[PDB]
């Protein structure tokens, strides 16, 4: 809805409205984990949900990077032989 | 005019004062701008009877000019920047005009280095400048005039490449640019010029068919997919661009000089069937994160939307090959689910609107009709170029029609021999008919060929798939 | 000389220059993912404690 | 990818050699055809005389 | 023909209701709009033509068409119908299309298509508070498309039928101001453009009228739109025709300036016609690459010395020299001012000033007025506001007025204005 952590709320709870644009470059994972580490008033279950969000988005980056490597595999194999 | 040496000496004075003041390092904008402006038509007949080594030294000089902004890698310095590209673009215009200028062009008044240089200039500066601000996905009159110069230079590049053979180390990247702008928005006239370029490279060389189809299938996902200005090719009835690109690849290869006609024409259907087979097999399965289906539906409605116009043939051949592929695939059980349901859906669409076209269309005589239509399209080629390829495709089509008539008596042998003689006479030969009459006579010719008379047969194929072992497919059938 | 120079695929300069750049863009991102992996492994150990 | 890139690097030097040979062959071909047109002109005038 | 537009529009709606019942019975369709043929609507066009003939209260049907605009929207876009009823002799068996009727129909077409392009009513009927809705603009655009594709076809044999008719050519060449030129790039009809260029070249070389030359020059300037791809293709024909006219002008002038025999009326007519064409096409187009100020200035100086030769030649020479001077003035504010050609241009302007002062002292009164207005142009060129637009190197060009010239101007104004 609103906030830097709103995308993580969508990932933890909705997960359907997420698109590839947010997945690729919207935030740095290592940044946001150190954002969430020292926060005050942090309830246990909401921390668990933020862990859901970060785990989900990290694994989605791994799947999309695997994908990227796949079309890399297609583009490297081409060659031109006039014979 | 046999000489018209009344501004021939004007231009000749221009280059001799230029190479005097430069040879004994830039020549500035205005002089070269007017030089290209007069080079448009004044030397287009008068370039002959000019000193050859002076041509070599001036193309070397303007080569050294275009070296400067060749891969240039680029509030007040921007004025220098824009004037640099406009100056070198005018220089590019002079190169691409000067080389093509004579109808007969003597060998080695050129070196491929300068054509390579204008090519790489085109590559870098086009991809740097014109795509990002005419397509925000990749992201005042100077841009517009630069655009028009790009259009003119690539058109002249196309006809120059048709004039003479070039090396493959040019062919690969000129084909790359000929296909490049077909996935951005506001480039329609550039796309016509790119059609001209791909006619030149495709009909001129038979060794890059595989190449062209592979770069076609690579970046199909980059299509705009926008409701605004998707169909912008007049024939109302505007059509999408890459469909007409495919069509002119289909009709572009003839290789008109005996059995050369037959083998080249079956080569044409083979190249087409490889194209559509690979395109279909890439489309049929659902790939990750994207799809090629909507490409296939819009492509095929455009294909049958341009089914029967006398200057767009072979769409009937596409539809016959479509019927053959669909009966080959969906009858089995081994093929994947999405391909079968796709082919059944396109079969339903073509059958329905073909049926309504059939019920809404109709409601030496053959030689007379053939000669009248060929005269009318000869007029059209005298008016509109590049349709000579369609004419030669038609000649091959009638040759193979008489062939399939021959193998399916002696009076029919005499008749087909007379038709063969007429065809060869019109080969050696290589009124007041209208476009509407041309459409009527070409749909009459299509009615003569056993093509539209198989519709119920296709329904029969549906009858062969009425009983199935899988429910979903026959439900939506 | 050129009869023996016939069987080799072309455009290798374009291929190598392009694909080295794509290699480097995959290199830095794959270097990133492992650093995030140890980061989340450490943070899991923290959350457990 | 790394080994495929290295293979295309040797083939990149190979293509450099191939294209050098190709241009010098074309230059020689054009030179001998200049020679054949010059001899042609010569022969023409000789036969006319 | 009321000045008030609502009254006129109500009257025109009444007229459309009354006098249009050839095949429309003011009832249902299948016989009312068109009978599927290219014939029923001909008679509606016919009493439009007859109404314009009898309406002698106007030489132009502008107010009549504006009144009949919204009431007969479907009828006024059917341009193909009166196109066959103007050129290719329809199968209705009617009489020959009368020349007065031809001019009347052409004037009606001028009015209808100009109202089709621009929707604003003419002066007196003007409002200025006009807003365009989406429906209005889409109707305007596809109207432009259909008129473009129709009339690129019809204008070649239109001119071929009416090449010698000066006023009909002048009327017909106002429509190309409203043609979207990129449709030519999409329609691939630049060949018909070039055919019409050769046809209007034949008209230009066959006609000597100043008005038709003005219309042709304006048409060329409209189609000299550099923002469209066709600019090279049209510039081919423009350069060809002006080069022909340069050669003809030099050939005629180098024999006219010498006394010889005689100079007779034929050489005078050739010089006057060629200089008329050159001046007309030099007004709208930069043609200073063909420096004919030598010939024009020699003609002006021999007009000064002799004084016994026709008025119109001197008028055309003065205007053409002024056009050359102002077109040179165009390519000095382009950010690249030199100094040698700057002083050369100032000297030529000073010679032109002397010629204009002599022509103001010349006894001919239209020559006096033309010299006065040319001097006005020269002084506003070298005015104090020349320094407004961030200029530095134009200071040598600035020329101060002469007190005797000022007194001559005041005397001319008092003798020829305040009467």
From Swiss-Prot, chain A:
<feature type="cross-link" description="Glycyl lysine isopeptide (Lys-Gly) (interchain with G-Cter in SUMO2)">
    <location>
        <position position="39"/>
    </location>
</feature>
<feature type="modified residue" description="Phosphoserine">
    <location>
        <position position="37"/>
    </location>
</feature>
<protein>
    <recommendedName>
        <fullName>Double-strand-break repair protein rad21 homolog</fullName>
    </recommendedName>
</protein>
<comment type="subunit">
    <text>Component of the cohesin complex, which consists of an SMC1A/B and SMC3 heterodimer core and 2 non-Smc subunits RAD21 and STAG1/SA1, STAG2/SA2 or STAG3/SA3. Interacts (via C-terminus) with SMC1A and (via N-terminus) with SMC3; these interactions are direct. The cohesin complex interacts with NUMA1. The cohesin complex also interacts with CDCA5, PDS5A and PDS5B; this interaction might regulate the ability of the cohesin complex to mediate sister chromatid cohesion. The interaction with PDS5B is direct and is stimulated by STAG1/SA1.</text>
</comment>
<comment type="similarity">
    <text>Belongs to the rad21 family.</text>
</comment>
UniProtKB/Swiss-Prot annotation, chain B:
<comment type="function">
    <text>Plays an important role in the loading of the cohesin complex on to DNA. Forms a heterodimeric complex (also known as cohesin loading complex) with MAU2/SCC4 which mediates the loading of the cohesin complex onto chromatin. Plays a role in cohesin loading at sites of DNA damage. Its recruitment to double-strand breaks (DSBs) sites occurs in a CBX3-, RNF8- and RNF168-dependent manner whereas its recruitment to UV irradiation-induced DNA damage sites occurs in a ATM-, ATR-, RNF8- and RNF168-dependent manner.</text>
</comment>
<comment type="similarity">
    <text>Belongs to the SCC2/Nipped-B family.</text>
</comment>
<comment type="subunit">
    <text>Heterodimerizes with MAU2/SCC4 to form the cohesin loading complex. The NIPBL-MAU2 heterodimer interacts with the cohesin complex composed of SMC1A/B and SMC3 heterodimer, RAD21 and STAG1/SA1. NIPBL directly contacts all members of the complex, RAD21, SMC1A/B, SMC3 and STAG1. Interacts directly (via PxVxL motif) with CBX5. Interacts with ZNF609 (via N-terminus). Interacts with the multiprotein complex Integrator. Interacts (via PxVxL motif) with CBX3. Interacts with BRD4.</text>
</comment>
<feature type="repeat" description="HEAT 1">
    <location>
        <begin position="452"/>
        <end position="477"/>
    </location>
</feature>
<protein>
    <recommendedName>
        <fullName>Nipped-B-like protein</fullName>
    </recommendedName>
</protein>
<feature type="modified residue" description="Phosphoserine">
    <location>
        <position position="5"/>
    </location>
</feature>
UniProtKB/Swiss-Prot annotation, chain D:
<comment type="function">
    <text>Central component of cohesin, a complex required for chromosome cohesion during the cell cycle. The cohesin complex may form a large proteinaceous ring within which sister chromatids can be trapped. At anaphase, the complex is cleaved and dissociates from chromatin, allowing sister chromatids to segregate. Cohesion is coupled to DNA replication and is involved in DNA repair. The cohesin complex also plays an important role in spindle pole assembly during mitosis and in chromosomes movement.</text>
</comment>
<comment type="subunit">
    <text>Forms a heterodimer with SMC1A or SMC1B in cohesin complexes. Cohesin complexes are composed of the SMC1 (SMC1A or SMC1B) and SMC3 heterodimer attached via their SMC hinge domain, RAD21 which link them, and one STAG protein (STAG1, STAG2 or STAG3), which interacts with RAD21. Also found in meiosis-specific cohesin complexes. Found in a complex with SMC1A, CDCA5 and RAD21, PDS5A/SCC-112 and PDS5B/APRIN. Interacts with NUMA1, and forms a ternary complex with KIF3B and KIFAP3, suggesting a function in tethering the chromosomes to the spindle pole and in chromosome movement.</text>
</comment>
<protein>
    <recommendedName>
        <fullName>Structural maintenance of chromosomes protein 3</fullName>
    </recommendedName>
</protein>
<comment type="similarity">
    <text>Belongs to the SMC family. SMC3 subfamily.</text>
</comment>
Curated annotation (Swiss-Prot), chain E:
<protein>
    <recommendedName>
        <fullName>Cohesin subunit SA-1</fullName>
    </recommendedName>
</protein>
<comment type="subunit">
    <text>Cohesin complexes are composed of a heterodimer between a SMC1 protein (SMC1A or SMC1B) and SMC3, which are attached via their hinge domain, and RAD21 which link them at their heads, and one STAG protein (STAG1, STAG2 or STAG3). In cohesin complexes, STAG1 is mutually exclusive with STAG2 and STAG3. Interacts directly with RAD21 in cohesin complex. The cohesin complex interacts with the cohesin loading complex subunits NIPBL/Scc2 (via HEAT repeats) and MAU2/Scc4. NIPBL directly contacts all members of the complex, RAD21, SMC1A/B, SMC3 and STAG1.</text>
</comment>
<comment type="function">
    <text>Component of cohesin complex, a complex required for the cohesion of sister chromatids after DNA replication. The cohesin complex apparently forms a large proteinaceous ring within which sister chromatids can be trapped. At anaphase, the complex is cleaved and dissociates from chromatin, allowing sister chromatids to segregate. The cohesin complex may also play a role in spindle pole assembly during mitosis.</text>
</comment>
<comment type="similarity">
    <text>Belongs to the SCC3 family.</text>
</comment>
<feature type="modified residue" description="Phosphoserine">
    <location>
        <position position="336"/>
    </location>
</feature>
């Amino acid at each position: 809805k609103r906030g830097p952590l709103a995308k993580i709320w969508l990932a933890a709870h909705w997960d359907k409205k997420l698109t590839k644009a947010h997945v690729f470059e919207c935030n740095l994972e290592s940044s946001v984990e150190s954002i969430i580490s020292p926060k005050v008033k942090m309830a246990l279950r909401t921390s668990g949900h933020l862990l859901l969000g970060v785990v989900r988005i990290y694994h989605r980056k791994a799947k999309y990077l695997l994908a990227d490597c796949n079309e890399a595999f297609i583009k490297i194999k081409m060659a031109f032989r006039p014979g | 005019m046999m000489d018209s040496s009344t501004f021939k000496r004007f231009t000749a004075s221009i280059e001799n004062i230029l190479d005097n003041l430069e040879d004994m390092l830039l020549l500035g904008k205005h002089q070269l701008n007017e030089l290209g402006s007069e080079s448009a038509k004044i030397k287009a007949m008068g370039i002959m009877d000019k000193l050859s080594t002076d041509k070599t030294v001036k193309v070397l000089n303007i080569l050294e000019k275009n070296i400067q902004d060749g891969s240039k890698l680029s509030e007040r310095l921007w004025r220098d920047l824009i004037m640099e590209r406009v100056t070198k673009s005018a220089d590019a215009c002079l190169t691409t005009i000067n080389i093509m200028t004579s109808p007969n062009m003597p060998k080695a008044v050129y070196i491929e280095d300068v054509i390579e240089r204008v090519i790489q200039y085109t590559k870098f500066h086009l991809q740097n400048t014109l795509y990002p601000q005419y397509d925000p996905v990749y992201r005042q009159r100077v841009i517009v005039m630069l655009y028009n110069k790009v259009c003119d230079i690539v058109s002249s590049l196309s006809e120059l490449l048709e004039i003479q053979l070039l090396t493959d180390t040019t062919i690969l990247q000129v084909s790359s640019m000929g296909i490049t702008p077909f996935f951005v928005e506001n480039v329609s006239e550039l796309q016509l010029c790119a059609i001209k370029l791909v006619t030149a490279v495709f009909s001129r060389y038979e060794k890059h068919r595989q190449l062209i189809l592979e770069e076609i299938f690579t970046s199909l996902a980059r299509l705009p997919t926008s409701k605004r200005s998707l169909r912008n090719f007049r024939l109302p009835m505007y059509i999408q661009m890459v469909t007409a690109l495919v069509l002119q690849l289909i009709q572009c290869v003839v290789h008109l000089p005996d059995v050369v006609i037959t083998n080249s024409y079956e080569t044409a259907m083979r190249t087409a069937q490889n194209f559509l087979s690979i395109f279909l097999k890439k489309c049929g399965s659902k790939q990750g994160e994207e799809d090629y289906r909507p490409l296939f539906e819009n492509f095929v409605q455009d294909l049958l939307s341009t089914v029967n116009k006398p200057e767009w043939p072979a769409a009937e051949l596409l539809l016959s090959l479509l019927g053959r592929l669909l009966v080959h695939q969906f009858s089995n059980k081994s093929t994947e689910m999405a391909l079968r349901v796709a082919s059944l859906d396109y079969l339903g669409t073509v059958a329905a609107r073909l049926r309504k076209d059939a019920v809404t269309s109709k409601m030496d005589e053959i030689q007379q009709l053939q000669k009248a239509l060929l005269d009318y399209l000869d007029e059209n080629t005298e008016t509109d170029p590049s349709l000579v390829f369609s004419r030669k495709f038609y000649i091959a089509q009638w040759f193979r029609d008489t062939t399939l008539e021959t193998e399916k008596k002696e009076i029919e042998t005499t008749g087909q021999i007379m038709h063969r003689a007429e065809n060869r006479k019109k080969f050696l030969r290589s009124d007041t008919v209208d476009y509407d009459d041309a459409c009527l006579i070409v749909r009459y010719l299509a009615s003569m060929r056993p093509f539209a008379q198989s519709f119920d047969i296709y329904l029969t194929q549906i009858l062969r798939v009425l009983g199935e072992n899988a429910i979903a497919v026959r439900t939506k059938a | 000389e050129l009869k023996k120079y016939s069987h080799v695929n072309k455009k290798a300069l374009d291929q190598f220059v392009n694909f080295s750049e794509q290699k480097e863009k995959l290199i830095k991102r794959q270097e990133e993912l492992d650093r995030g992996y140890k980061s989340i492994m450490e943070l899991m150990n923290v959350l457990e404690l | 990818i790394e080994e495929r890139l290295h293979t295309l690097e040797e083939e990149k030097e190979e293509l450099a050699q191939y294209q050098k040979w190709d241009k010098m062959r074309r230059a020689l071909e054009y030179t001998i055809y200049n020679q054949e047109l010059n001899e042609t002109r010569a022969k023409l005038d000789e036969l006319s005389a | 023909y009321s000045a008030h537009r609502p009254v006129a529009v109500a009257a025109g709606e009444f007229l459309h209701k009354k006098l249009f019942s050839r095949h429309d019975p003011q009832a249902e369709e299948a016989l009312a709009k068109r009978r599927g043929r290219n014939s029923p609507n001909g008679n509606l066009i016919r009493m439009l033509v007859l109404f314009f003939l009898e309406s002698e209260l106007h030489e132009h049907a502008a107010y009549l068409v504006d009144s009949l605009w919204e009431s007969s929207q479907e009828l006024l876009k059917d341009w193909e119908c009166m196109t066959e009823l103007l050129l290719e002799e329809p199968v209705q068996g009617e009489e020959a299309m009368s020349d007065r009727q031809e001019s009347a129909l052409i004037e009606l077409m001028v009015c209808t298509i100009r109202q089709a392009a621009e929707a604003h009513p003419p002066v007196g009927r003007g409002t200025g508070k006009r807003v365009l809705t989406a429906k209005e603009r889409k109707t305007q655009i596809d109207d432009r498309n259909k008129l473009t594709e129709h009339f690129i076809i019809t204008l070649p044999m239109l001119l071929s039928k009416y090449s010698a008719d000066a006023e009909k050519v002048a009327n017909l060449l106002q429509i190309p101001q409203y043609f979207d030129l990129e449709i030519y790039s999409t329609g691939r009809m630049e060949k018909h453009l070039d055919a019409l260029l050769k046809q209007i070249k034949f008209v230009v070389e066959k006609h000597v009228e100043s008005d038709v030359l003005e219309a042709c020059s304006k048409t060329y300037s409209i189609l000299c739109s550099e923002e469209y791809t066709i600019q090279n293709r049209v510039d081919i024909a423009r350069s060809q025709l002006i080069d022909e006219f340069v050669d003809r002008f030099n050939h005629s002038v180098e024999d006219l300036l010498q006394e010889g025999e005689e100079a007779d009326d034929d050489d005078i007519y050739n010089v006057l016609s060629t200089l008329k064409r050159l001046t007309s096409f030099h007004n709208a187009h930069d043609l200073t690459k063909w420096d004919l100020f030598g010939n024009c200035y020699r003609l002006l100086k021999t007009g000064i010395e002799h004084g016994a030769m026709p008025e119109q030649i001197v008028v055309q020479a003065l205007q053409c020299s002024h056009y050359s001077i102002l077109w040179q003035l165009v390519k000095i504010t382009d950010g690249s001012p030199s100094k040698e050609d700057l002083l050369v241009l100032r000297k030529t302007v000073k010679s032109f000033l002397a010629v204009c002062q002599q022509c103001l002292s010349n006894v001919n009164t239209p020559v006096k007025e033309q010299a006065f207005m040319l001097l006005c142009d020269l002084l506003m060129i070298f005015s104090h506001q020349l320094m407004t637009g961030g200029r530095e190197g134009l200071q040598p060009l600035v020329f101060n007025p002469d007190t005797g010239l000022q007194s001559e101007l005041l005397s001319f104004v008092m003798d020829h204005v305040f009467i």
